[PDB]
């Protein structure tokens, strides 16, 4: 259902936000920790113990989960279609 153009952006869209989350939480009253946090959500694997202590990452993490859920649900419909 999804062409290779989509998979070109999937591998970078998840990665680009990883450094951003490390940027927001650190400079408020690392890279490896955030990398396992975002990718694990997409694959639904409980990897790593890193947690969004800062409130900014939590609200961004909240909407981020919804981005993964639509991908899985929609793709299942296409295959069944």
């Amino acid at each position: 259902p999804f062409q290779s153009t989509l998979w070109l952006l999937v591998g970078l869209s998840v990665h680009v936000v990883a450094v951003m989350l490390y940027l927001l939480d650190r400079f408020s009253p690392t890279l490896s920790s955030a990398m396992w946090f975002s990718w694990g959500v997409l694959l639904n694997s409980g990897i790593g113990e890193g947690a969004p202590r800062s409130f900014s990452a939590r609200i961004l993490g909240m909407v981020w989960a919804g981005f993964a859920m639509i991908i899985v649900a929609s793709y299942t419909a296409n295959l069944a279609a």
């Binding site: 927001l24 009253p29 409130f55 900014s56 609200i59 961004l60 909407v63 981020w64």
Partner: peptide, 15 residues
């Protein structure tokens, strides 16, 4: 829409 969500709230946390 969520990209700038943290940027707006980032300033508000300082004060």
């Amino acid at each position: 829409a969520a990209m700038a969500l943290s940027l707006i709230t980032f300033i508000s946390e300082h004060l």
